[PDB]
Amino acid sequence: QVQLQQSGAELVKPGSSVKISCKASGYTFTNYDMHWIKQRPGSGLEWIGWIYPGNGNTKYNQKFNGKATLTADKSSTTAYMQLSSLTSEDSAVYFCVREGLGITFEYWGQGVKVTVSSAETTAPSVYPLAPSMVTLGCLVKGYFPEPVTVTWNSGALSSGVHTFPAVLQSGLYTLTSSVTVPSSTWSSQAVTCNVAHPASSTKVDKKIVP
Amino acid sequence: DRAGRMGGEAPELALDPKKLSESLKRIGDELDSNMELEVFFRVAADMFSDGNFNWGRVVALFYFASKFLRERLLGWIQDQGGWDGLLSYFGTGTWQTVTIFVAGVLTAS
Amino acid sequence: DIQMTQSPSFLSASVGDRVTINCKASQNVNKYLDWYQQNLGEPPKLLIYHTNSLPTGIPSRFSGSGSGTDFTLTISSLQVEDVATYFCLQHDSGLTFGSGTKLEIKRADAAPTVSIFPPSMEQLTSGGATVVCFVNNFYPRDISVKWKIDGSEQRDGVLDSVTDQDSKDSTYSMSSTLSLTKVEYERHNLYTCEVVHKTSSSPVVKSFNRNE
């Protein structure tokens, strides 16, 4: 099995730089060109450039000349991409990908999500959403960074749950989650949304009361 | 130069729709497919020291180079009718025969 | 650079359908055109390379053809696990990806359940107010959600989010939030979530009065 394992800082302030690594294993590293790919909404998938580890030769997409620097170390069988002078437009997922022999982009790294922002680490405020089937929810407002995790009754409720993708409200994230239960259940039994934010050691319980 | 080909030889450059340059990497692909196949000039000056040059040994040096023409080989080349000899060398010979011979030259160095 | 025009952008189909996706290059790229499949949270997966070659482990229901300027990816008989986004890639001169085709499963129409929620007491004491509307388990995807305050439409402070197609019932759900200051919220009476969807001839309307 060929494996490409990436690592890199995921939250950076505008104007600083970031180094993404791509550790290759399971093949002879210096026999294959390694390419780098950017993915973000609106802009789509874009080719950044390639490096050949056999000699350190590189080739860059014009649009990324200067923004990206590609290097390879044969000894650690790892390729690197440095991105400098970050702005918000550089928030994206970045992939390393191996070009095969007689075949193209067969093996990919898992991708590294890079978020460029000035926002400070911020725990969310959690608010109950209360009105023969009953919909309830809770609102997870003003947090940073991604992600949070939501459960209903620690997981005892799952089949009628919808957790929605967060939206960026100023520089903070906001997310909602809903659950649907019988009206009989609503009046006789408790429903609680459990909210956890790892990047702030936060864990909240909000019982939904009429 | 590189290992792959995606993006083309000269990306974003206009090309027209010298043939030696293509056949060179063809023989290189064949040699690559024979897998068992400061020590540079030690092996390189070993490949040409007996003064019995042949086109196979030229090819075998690049499989140390892509992997002097004046001060040693140039007289032999012009006595060969120029590079009309090397392309004719790939001609009056098997793809496999040429490849096996050049591998031999590398095996003995 | 060479421009890739991929179409359609959105494709609905059923298990067992033959599906085709088209890609057009702004100049001849020879055979050097690939197709990739991508699921959420994953890198793309190579499906077809060099116009029509199958990588190892890719089921034979995938095939491709092309002329050098016009290309197609065909799925002979769609399977559940083929629901994803598909991209073409030219690599003859530079590298250019198409903009993508999202492939969804078709199902019978499903009218959304719409629910509106006033801001909570816990939020109002902070000086802010967010009204919330859920629009859950609908199909097809095309839908419009608008907020009205005392009869008049509100665009500022409105953010909405949509789930991907649910594996359980092939439906979509959407959440919309309207944010206001507590003071501005308390100047109004009627708050309305209004939903335009194929399953009803007039828009669906859920409301509450701030009095109650």
Side-chain angles (χ1 to χ4, degrees), chain A residues 2-61 63-88 90-119 121-202 204-210, chain B residues 2-8 10-11 13-17 23-25 27-87 89-109, chain C residues 1-154 156-212:
Chain A
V2 175
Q3 291 198 13
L4 273 37
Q5 298 212 40
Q6 293 183 244
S7 72
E10 312 196 353
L11 174 60
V12 285
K13 313 267 187 179
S16 54
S17 88
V18 63
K19 207 172 178 64
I20 301 307
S21 71
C22 174
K23 163 74 179 190
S25 55
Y27 69 101
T28 296
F29 183 65
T30 51
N31 282 355
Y32 300 89
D33 300 338
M34 188 70 73
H35 302 240
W36 290 81
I37 308 292
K38 169 180 195 182
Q39 185 170 30
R40 68 164 284 147
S43 179
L45 280 157
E46 290 175 290
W47 172 74
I48 297 172
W50 53 259
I51 173 158
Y52 176 31
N55 54 25
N57 188 19
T58 62
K59 183 77 60 175
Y60 291 96
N61 187 343
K63 180 170 176 181
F64 293 94
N65 261 119
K67 160 75 61 184
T69 302
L70 305 178
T71 52
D73 174 19
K74 317 184 180 191
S75 292
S76 56
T77 65
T78 303
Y80 301 98
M81 176 175 69
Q82 196 138 22
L83 303 178
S84 56
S85 297
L86 300 165
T87 80
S88 71
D90 302 330
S91 299
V93 173
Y94 295 89
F95 298 104
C96 62
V97 61
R98 191 184 82 161
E99 180 182 347
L101 171 65
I103 189 171
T104 52
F105 286 160
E106 191 169 25
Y107 296 94
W108 297 64
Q110 82 280 9
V112 168
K113 182 151 170 282
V114 177
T115 295
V116 188
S117 163
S118 333
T121 283
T122 298
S125 322
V126 187
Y127 303 112
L129 301 174
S132 71
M133 298 302 304
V134 184
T135 300
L136 319 165
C138 68
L139 167 63
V140 182
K141 195 188 182 298
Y143 67 93
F144 192 88
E146 282 263 56
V148 299
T149 37
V150 186
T151 56
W152 292 89
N153 286 359
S154 307
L157 290 185
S158 83
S159 63
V161 176
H162 289 109
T163 301
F164 301 83
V167 295
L168 180 64
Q169 199 175 19
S170 290
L172 300 185
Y173 293 106
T174 285
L175 156 159
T176 65
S177 170
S178 73
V179 61
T180 299
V181 293
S183 287
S184 74
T185 302
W186 181 216
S187 55
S188 67
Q189 292 169 335
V191 172
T192 301
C193 87
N194 329 95
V195 175
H197 191 212
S200 67
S201 299
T202 301
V204 191
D205 291 319
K206 277 300 187 164
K207 184 180 172 180
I208 311 298
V209 178
Chain B
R2 63 181 295 201
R5 62 140 302 289
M6 294 179 75
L13 260 62
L15 304 186
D16 259 344
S23 181
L24 288 196
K25 298 201 71 176
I27 215 74
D29 287 334
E30 298 307 320
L31 293 168
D32 285 332
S33 309
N34 174 279
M35 295 296 165
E36 60 281 3
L37 159 72
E38 192 212 15
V39 314
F40 162 67
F41 270 135
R42 214 85 96 181
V43 152
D46 159 84
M47 279 187 197
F48 293 86
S49 69
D50 72 353
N52 287 322
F53 305 153
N54 61 65
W55 280 119
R57 297 182 183 190
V58 190
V59 179
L61 178 63
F62 291 169
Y63 208 64
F64 265 50
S66 60
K67 167 150 184 176
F68 177 77
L69 186 69
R70 294 180 180 255
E71 254 288 345
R72 188 78 174 116
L73 266 301
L74 184 40
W76 180 78
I77 299 193
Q78 52 193 9
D79 295 17
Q80 288 276 317
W83 302 87
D84 292 279
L86 170 63
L87 297 176
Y89 179 86
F90 295 115
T92 59
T94 319
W95 269 125
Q96 286 71 29
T97 292
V98 164
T99 305
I100 298 311
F101 180 80
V102 175
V105 175
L106 298 155
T107 293
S109 197
Chain C
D1 54 277
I2 297 160
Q3 303 279 65
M4 300 316 288
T5 296
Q6 187 177 334
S7 66
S9 296
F10 186 71
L11 196 39
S12 301
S14 301
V15 173
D17 289 357
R18 181 170 49 207
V19 165
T20 288
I21 300 175
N22 286 275
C23 186
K24 267 211 58 179
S26 57
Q27 72 158 15
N28 167 65
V29 301
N30 293 312
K31 71 173 173 181
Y32 295 117
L33 180 116
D34 301 349
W35 295 94
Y36 295 85
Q37 181 198 68
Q38 188 183 30
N39 292 293
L40 190 270
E42 288 181 344
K45 181 157 74 185
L46 183 60
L47 292 175
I48 298 284
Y49 67 100
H50 297 176
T51 306
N52 66 347
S53 294
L54 265 186
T56 176
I58 299 306
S60 65
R61 61 180 188 273
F62 293 94
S63 60
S65 66
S67 65
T69 56
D70 301 282
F71 298 85
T72 60
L73 169 74
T74 296
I75 309 175
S76 68
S77 169
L78 190 79
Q79 304 294 94
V80 168
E81 64 267 25
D82 304 333
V83 170
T85 308
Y86 293 79
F87 299 96
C88 55
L89 163 72
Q90 77 80 24
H91 46 101
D92 176 70
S93 182
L95 291 82
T96 308
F97 296 88
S99 59
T101 301
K102 168 181 296 287
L103 188 53
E104 69 155 22
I105 284 302
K106 186 170 301 172
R107 56 152 285 159
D109 293 352
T113 64
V114 181
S115 315
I116 186 174
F117 301 88
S120 61
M121 184 188 298
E122 290 93 323
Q123 186 181 32
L124 285 169
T125 70
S126 71
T130 295
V131 197
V132 179
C133 181
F134 298 117
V135 185
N136 294 342
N137 307 102
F138 61 91
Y139 188 88
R141 170 67 176 81
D142 339 282
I143 194 164
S144 169
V145 180
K146 298 166 191 165
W147 290 90
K148 290 181 166 189
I149 292 179
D150 283 314
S152 178
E153 184 190 3
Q154 264 293 294
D156 27 350
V158 178
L159 301 158
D160 47 44
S161 199
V162 187
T163 68
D164 270 276
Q165 193 171 32
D166 193 2
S167 337
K168 298 307 203 309
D169 58 11
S170 307
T171 72
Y172 298 91
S173 299
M174 177 178 193
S175 162
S176 184
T177 61
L178 162 67
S179 287
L180 300 168
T181 59
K182 165 186 174 63
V183 36
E184 179 62 27
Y185 172 69
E186 274 169 355
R187 290 176 50 89
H188 301 285
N189 307 123
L190 181 66
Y191 292 82
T192 291
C193 182
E194 183 184 308
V195 180
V196 172
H197 192 252
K198 165 190 190 201
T199 50
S200 64
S201 48
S202 295
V204 173
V205 170
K206 296 299 174 82
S207 293
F208 68 84
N209 203 249
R210 190 180 41 80
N211 277 335
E212 303 162 345

